[PDB]
Amino acid sequence: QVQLQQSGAELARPGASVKLSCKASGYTFTSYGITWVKQRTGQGLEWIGEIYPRSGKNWYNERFKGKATLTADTSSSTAYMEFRSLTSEDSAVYFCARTEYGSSPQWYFDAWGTGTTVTVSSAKTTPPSVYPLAPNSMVTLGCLVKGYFPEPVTVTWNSGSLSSGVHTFPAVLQSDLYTLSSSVTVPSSPRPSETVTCNVAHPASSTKVDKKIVPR
Amino acid sequence: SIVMTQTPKFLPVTADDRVTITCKASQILNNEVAWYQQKPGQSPKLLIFYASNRYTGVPDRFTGSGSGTDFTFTISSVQVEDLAVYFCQQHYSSPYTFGGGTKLEVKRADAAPTVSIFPPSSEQLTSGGASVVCFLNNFYPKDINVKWKIDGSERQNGVLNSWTDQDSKDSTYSMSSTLTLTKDEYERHNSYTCEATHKTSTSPIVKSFNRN
Amino acid sequence: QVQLVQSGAEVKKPGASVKVSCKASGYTFTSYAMHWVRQAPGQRLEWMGWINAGNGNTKYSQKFQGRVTITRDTSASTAYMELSSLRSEDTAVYYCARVGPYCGGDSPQDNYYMDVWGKGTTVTVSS
Amino acid sequence: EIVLTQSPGTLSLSPGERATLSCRASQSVSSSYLAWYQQKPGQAPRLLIYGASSRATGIPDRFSGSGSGTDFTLTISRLEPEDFAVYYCQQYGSSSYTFGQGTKLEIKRLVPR
Ligand SMILES: [Cl-]
Numbered sequence A: 001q002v003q004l005q006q007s008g009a010e011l012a013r014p015g016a017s018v019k020l021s022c023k024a025s026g027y028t029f030t031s032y033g034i035t036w037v038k039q040r041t042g043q044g045l046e047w048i049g050e051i052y053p054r055s056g057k058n059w060y061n062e063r064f065k066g067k068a069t070l071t072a073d074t075s076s077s078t079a080y081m082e083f084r085s086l087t088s089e090d091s092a093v094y095f096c097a098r099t100e101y102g103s104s105p106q107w108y109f110d111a112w113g114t115g116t117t118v119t120v121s122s123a124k125t126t127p128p129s130v131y132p133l134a135p136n137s138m139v140t141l142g143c144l145v146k147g148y149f150p151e152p153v154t155v156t157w158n159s160g161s162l163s164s165g166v167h168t169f170p171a172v173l174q175s176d177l178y179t180l181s182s183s184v185t186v187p188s189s190p191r192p193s194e195t196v197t198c199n200v201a202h203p204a205s206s207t208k209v210d211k212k213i214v215p216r
Numbered sequence B: 001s002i003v004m005t006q007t008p009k010f011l012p013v014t015a016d017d018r019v020t021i022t023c024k025a026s027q028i029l030n031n032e033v034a035w036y037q038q039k040p041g042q043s044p045k046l047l048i049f050y051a052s053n054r055y056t057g058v059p060d061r062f063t064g065s066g067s068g069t070d071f072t073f074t075i076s077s078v079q080v081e082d083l084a085v086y087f088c089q090q091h092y093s094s095p096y097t098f099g100g101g102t103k104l105e106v107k108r109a110d111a112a113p114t115v116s117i118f119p120p121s122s123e124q125l126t127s128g129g130a131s132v133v134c135f136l137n138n139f140y141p142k143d144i145n146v147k148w149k150i151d152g153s154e155r156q157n158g159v160l161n162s163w164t165d166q167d168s169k170d171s172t173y174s175m176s177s178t179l180t181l182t183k184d185e186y187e188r189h190n191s192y193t194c195e196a197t198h199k200t201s202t203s204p205i206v207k208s209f210n211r212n
Numbered sequence C: 001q002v003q004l005v006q007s008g009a010e011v012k013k014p015g016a017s018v019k020v021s022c023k024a025s026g027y028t029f030t031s032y033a034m035h036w037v038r039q040a041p042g043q044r045l046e047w048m049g050w051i052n053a054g055n056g057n058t059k060y061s062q063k064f065q066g067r068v069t070i071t072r073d074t075s076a077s078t079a080y081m082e083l084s085s086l087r088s089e090d091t092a093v094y095y096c097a098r099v100g101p102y103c104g105g106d107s108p109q110d111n112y113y114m115d116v117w118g119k120g121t122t123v124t125v126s127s
Numbered sequence D: 001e002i003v004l005t006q007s008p009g010t011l012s013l014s015p016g017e018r019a020t021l022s023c024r025a026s027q028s029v030s031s032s033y034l035a036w037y038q039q040k041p042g043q044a045p046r047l048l049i050y051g052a053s054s055r056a057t058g059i060p061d062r063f064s065g066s067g068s069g070t071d072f073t074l075t076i077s078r079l080e081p082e083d084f085a086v087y088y089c090q091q092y093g094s095s096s097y098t099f100g101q102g103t104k105l106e107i108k109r110l111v112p113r
């Protein structure tokens, strides 16, 4: 089983540097190459460069030569990519992948790694402010989770007893913080008669909040 | 930097449909084109390499062909487990470049968005801020526009939007638009409105509330 | 285990053509180049041409341009060598050989020797 | 073209002795583009040395490659009966791929003693 385990999500400040890890297992590390691909959330892939661990020889995309540096440690079967002078444009998911090799590098990648999410920001760990959202047969309620950093948060409704008719929207960046929203739809008889509560947790700040949706 | 023009970018499909994805290169290649599958929140998986060759484990319904400038990737009969984004890639010369991608979705009957507007909560107003939230839930197709109006005056700045992916159950889409003001300006106006423009209706779906 | 299995011996008349096959197994066929070599009775090893099993590009010897045709079949992991308008001097053993694996050196040219050889295909041009 | 001239054409030696084969190029060739091969009668050639001095997989230590430029040398430390065969050198640079005429390493015939 080919496997490329990538380090945890990196959080760096602008102008700082980061070094991503890519530990390989399930095959002979020195028999293949390791490329790195950039993927900004919601769009295509971008090739960064290549390294051949057995010899250390590396190829680069001209766009990343000064910013990225590819190394590898055959003793630990780990590939590294160091980024310098980080900017908001560098925030993305970074994959490592194993490259096919024969009589020469083939430059297509048959095994991809976990994926490391890099966030370039100066924000500090901030807990969310959870705000209820209140206004026929159905009733739609909401839960506004605003001003937290970093990702992620978890959201449930009545401790999970409300699972159908629920969907949470992706977080957006608002004032260098994250803002999220969750929607729950229940029959109009259950509420306002029977309480509806949104359970929000922000593991990074070690905060839990339960906000009851009150009618106006 | 060779350009791989991949079409279509978005493709609705029904189970057992024949999917055909095209990928045109900006210059003449031999056959160094590979194809990848990426499911939401997952890593890409190689499917085809050198235009025609399947990778280990790939089912037979996935095929690829082409040479020179035109390359095609076909699914004989799409399955539910095949719903994902598909990329072509050229492994001919450096820098190696991928296509724009092709996202599949489950075809579905049209559905109008259930619109719901929520005024700022009492809790939030204790912080000098006010967020008006608008939900546009369970509509198809995905294409939709949301417009805000304060006392009938269109509002642009301060509006952040967010879209869900296609729901696994009802195969619908949902959106949330959030107008965020200061408590000061929020109290300078009376009515607040979000208008949803969707192909299911020639006139927008309007929801409003009065701060008083 | 890397193996190149060639087709059986051939006996042709002058003017005919012959096509030799080279079934490859034990490695990614499309990731390597392949050489074709012949050796006439009591003569040197003679290079004839190589083919990129991936894209199919070929380079032929100038002593054989026009007569030799090297092709590939990725679906079958088989290379082919066709020699037309045969004459007595073409009586020889024809070999297919895969090149070596790319070490991380200057260029793949550092490993375009004949790493793995086939066992040979005898072609005899009589009468 | 790049012509390779091996010498001697025939080398008659006994087991236990040292054999020294020479491959001379008409032009200067990079060491990384020089290969040696061994061919026993009836068999197919076998890779022996690549890159002028790198042994192929499963090649005894008594085989050693050397040289550079226009003069390359294959040396067999101590001859074993399995080592008597034909030996070809090859230049596999970008230009073309050419073999030498080959050295015939024979078993020396002796007078009774
Ligand atoms: Cl990820």
Ligand SMILES: [Cl-]
Pocket (backbone or CB within 6 Å): C100, C101, C115, D056, D057
């Ligand atoms: Cl080798």
